[model samples]
Each structure stands twice: as C-alpha cells, then as structure tokens.
Target chain A: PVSLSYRCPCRFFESHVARANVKHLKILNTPNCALQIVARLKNNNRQVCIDPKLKWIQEYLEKALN
Target chain B: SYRCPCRFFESHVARANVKHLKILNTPNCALQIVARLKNNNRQVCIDPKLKWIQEYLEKALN
Candidate 1:
C-alpha cells in the first residue's frame, strides 16, 4: 500500500510538492533501496548529477519546478 | 479480568537473554501480539524502538 507507481513521473512530483507546500524542490526524495548508490553517488545535489545514461527509465525526480 | 497495560514487553522474560526492541524487530513481536488476540479485545505490549523503525520508514518514504 505504501508503494507508489507513476504513470508519468513528472506529474507525480508536481502534485506531491504542490500539495505539501514545498517551495524548494529538495524536500522530496527517492525511497531508499538495498543498492542506495544512485542518490549517494550520482545525485550529489538537486538531482544534478544523475547518470545521463539512466534517464530513459526515469528513476530520479526533483520536488518541484523551482 | 484482563492484565494491566504492558509498557515494554520483552521477547524472553529475564533468562539473561536481554534484547532491545527495534522497529524492524517489531513485526515478529506484532505477529506474536496479534496471535494472542481472542474473540474480544487483547492489549499486547510493545517496546517500540522508535529511532530504529523511524529511520527505515522515513528513508523509504522520503
């Protein structure tokens, strides 16, 4: 029940961030997994360092359009 | 009558195998607590290690 699936990842962030009243987009984040590498290694800050190669699957998304 | 509310119930009561209760560990305890439930109401005690479990829930949810 806690699991969240996205049809289009963009909308997911848009709705959640706006609903939660988050002005800055860093409040929201990805759920922790066993790997735990993607956020730590690539995403140093603000989803900026996302592995460009991994974008096709759309794993990372920021909090809002700020 | 029913027993009074248990504050922190241990897995094993005082055989020198003292254990700390973590949220991750609570599922087993919750299962054991739930199992004790009869037709009416049953109050099973929990020694929730809030710090441990909150970390998992927060990290996963965030």
Candidate 2:
C-alpha cells in the first residue's frame, strides 16, 4: 500500500517531478519522480489536490507542527 | 480502475477521452507512492492553465 499520486490535465507534471531531486531524498529503489505515492489518509479523505511539491512540504510541516 | 494516487480516488476515463494525464503527488512525500504506481507509465502533464503548482509552493513556504 502506498500513500499518494497526482492526476492532472497536463501530462507535463509527470515529466516535471520525474526530473526533480529533493534536498535529503534517500535512494529507495529509485522512485518515480513524476508518479503517485499511495499515502492515502483513511479518515480525512485527503486526496485530489494540486501542488505536489508544495503538498509534500506542507504535509511535512503539518507533521512537524504537531 | 484508473485511480488518482494523489487522492486515491478512482474514475472512469474512456480510451478516447484521454487528452493528457498527470499521475503525480499532490506534494512531496508522494514520491514513494508515485514510484509504486509507475508501472502504468502514466505520462506527466504540464498545462499552463493548471499552473498553480507555483502558488502551492509559495503557500507552503510562507
């Protein structure tokens, strides 16, 4: 089971993230940069949102905030 | 069922209905999940009309 993935009108997004390299990203099987991660929230139904990079950082911040 | 991994929501898209699809993370950590779903070889999309990605990042930074 995974956490999340983004669906968009433009396919360029897949190409974009696929080319991104995070600051402290560890090599775990060389994940697809422009792909989905199944980090689904069972209770919140937090899916179908835009801004992948921002969302990741926001989620991280939310975690750190609490 | 072709589900959006970002939201884990499923939808029906006719074979001919597909114009451009972007199976990506709503944010950062979604990379892990995206990697898992890469088997589908979903193409990444970059539409100018849907270019709020920068705004999302700005919001995150602020």
TM-score of model number 2: 0.20
Candidate 1: list runs displaced more than 4 Å.
Answer: A1-66, B1-8, B11-46
lDDT of 1 by residue, A1-66 (tens): 697552322221211121112111111122323211122112233321122233321122211100
Error of 2 at B33 (Å): 10
Q: Pick the candidate with the highest TM-score.
A: 2
RMSD of each: 17.4, 16.6
Chain B only: TM-score of model 1: 0.23
DockQ of each: 0.04, 0.03
**C-alpha positional error of residue B23 in candidate 1 after TM-score superposition, expressed in Å:** 9.0
Candidate 2 recovers what fraction of true contacts? 0.00
Q: Which candidate's lDDT is highest?
A: 2
Query: For candidate 2, what is the DockQ-based docking class?
Result: incorrect
